[PDB]
A and B are shown apart, each in its own frame.
With several copies, the nearest count.
Chain A
């Protein structure tokens, strides 16, 4: 087995929660306190509670929350779970906290979260986006989540200006979110995701493949990765970004506009994000990615 998918006691201390395509990862770090990661989407909240109470007996013990970047598919649960979690503490980059304090880049997050709702669903009450507790964490700052875990924040841009990745040294797991790319259930090889800058993206993947041989690798979509896939996941994401760059430059040489390649990528890779992204918006997202790659790659 190489991609542990379903919710459950996912590891010796780690429990996936919510939908497997966009989960929140619960970490068992004490016999008092707990900790969540990868804060998902808004609609999973009523699901996540129905799972969370199965693990956490009383959610006052839930102390820490880890967040990877400002996009809606990793921070939807924040305003809808933070007030009922009284001891919650959200960690993210300084830019991420500044983004949430900003009036802009929150209404768009609300729209993106609201677009993925059911017919009769009504989301629960929520505090203001600036009102929730945040402690910004910078590059390389050692994190003391508990006596059994000592995570290390790593500045890993390329998917967004506000991005981080939480890295643990002892058990050698890694929370990437979308630092690498949306993992591929069918093909197995990573799908790159560049939406702000290649030069920071490939630099980040260099600084992530220089790490030790990872025993585990946990992206933001599609559960845990184990064994040989986690060992060289940082290499294959770099390789796939360069591969898509080669394809785009070749199609530019042939003369095909960006509209054809973005359409081809959308119809090829829409088989995952239909749940947590509208199809009409995924085309535009891939268009922005391909524009960045064409403008930056030689």
Chain B
């Protein structure tokens, strides 16, 4: 019937021949400006460093706003990104949403970020990603909210897949590969059994398993088993 479905097929077929990230973000900017929004951003929240989870982001906002993030790092306290952790629902911005951290919202509204929304999604590799879209005027009605939801959902799905395929620095975290014995021994450590129990069930001497443990610690760059097990569980390798 044309409209949405033909649009999705056309966008997919048009994004297929694009072999560069800048082309992907160019078509994204063109579509988001067709959707009525001046600014966009694609923001990936990692989950490896638990104390300081690094949030990295691309987009077309004022560059000094980006710089403001690299000084104060509002991604670690921004509620728009943090909504994706608790729920996968789209959230449209308001003064109510940012009551916990009003400094970010006030500084945003200072620089022409007064209307917008942010759709999160859990990527298949456990890395949270969000697509935000913003404009000055024309507060998002409840009528347009579902259309923006569907179109941002399609766009963020495609971008997530493509930027994973293009080996973008945002999506790709520290690459770690394990053969099946290392995955098995690390899984048995994740379902934590003592070393003697592991040796008994696997029927292998303690020296070989300790050699495997040292290999895993070196590969993850760990000082203890807990870092390796937690990082592997978070990254989904186990």
CB neighbours of B35 from chain A (8 A): 169, 212
- A206 in contact with B10 (CB, 8 Å): yes
The smallest C-beta distance from B112 to any residue of chain A, in angstroms, reads 12
B37, closest chain A residue (CB): A169
User: Is B68 located at the chain interface by the 8 A CB criterion?
Assistant: no
- Interface bits B197-209 vs A (CB < 8 Å: 1, else 0): 0000000000000
Given A170-B138, A206-B34, A212-B35: A231 and B10 within 8 A (CB)? no
B137 proximity list for chain A (CB < 8 A): 148
Contact A212 B6 (CB under 8 A): no
Q: How far is the CB of A204 from chain B (nearest CB, A)?
A: 11
Chain B contact patch, size range: 10 to 19
8 A Cβ contacts from B22-73 to A = 30, 33-36
Contact of A232 (CB < 8 Å), options: B1, B36, B143, B147: B1
A135 to B114, CA, bound (A): 32
Quick check: A212 and B151 within 8 Å, CB to CB?
yes
Of the four ranges (under 10, 10 to 19, 20 to 34, 35 or more), the interface on chain A belongs to: 20 to 34
From A140, A148, A169, A235, B2 is in contact (CB under 8 Å) with A235
Closest chain A CB from B142 CB (angstroms): 13
Instruction: Report the minimal beta-carbon distance from B108 to chain A, rounded to whole angstroms.
Output: 20
| Residue B5 at the chain A interface, CB threshold 8 Å | yes
Which of B34, B143, B147, B151 contacts A169, CB < 8 Å? B34
Which chain B positions have C-beta within 8 A of A84? none
B196 to chain A, nearest CB (A): 59
CB within 8 Å for A232 and B34 given contacts A210-B10, A212-B147: no
Q: Is B111 an interface residue (CB 8 A)?
A: no
Q: Beyond A210-B7, A212-B147, A213-B147, is A172–B1 a contact (Cβ under 8 Å)? A: no
The answer to whether B124 has its CB under 8 Å from any CB of chain A is no
Q: Does B169 touch A at the CB level, under 8 Å?
A: no
A194 contacts the other chain (CB 8 A): no
| 8 A Cβ contacts from A194-234 to B | 203, 206-207, 209-213, 215, 228, 231-232, 234
Interchain CB contact under 8 A, A231 and B1: yes
A238 touches B2 (CB 8 A): yes
A152 part of interface (Cβ distance < 8 Å): yes
Given that A212-B147, A213-B147, A232-B1 are contacting pairs, would A150 and B33 also be in contact in the complex, using a CB cutoff of 8 Å? yes
Q: Of B6, B147, B151, which contacts A209 at CB under 8 A?
A: B6
Q: A210-B10, A212-B147, A213-B147 are in contact. Are A203 and B2 (CB under 8 A)?
A: no
Distance of A31 from chain B, by nearest CB (Å): 16
Using known A-B contacts A212-B138, A212-B151, determine if residue A206 contacts B6 with beta carbons closer than 8 Å: yes
CA distance A163 to B218 in the complex (A): 65
Name 10 A/B residue pairs within 8 A (Cβ), A-sorted.
Answer: A167-B34, A170-B138, A207-B36, A210-B6, A210-B11, A211-B7, A212-B34, A235-B1, A235-B3, A238-B2
4 closest residue pairs by CB, A with B: A232-B1, A209-B2, A231-B1, A235-B2
Interface residues of B (CB under 8 A from A): 1-3, 5-7, 10-11, 30, 33-36, 137-138, 143-144, 147, 151
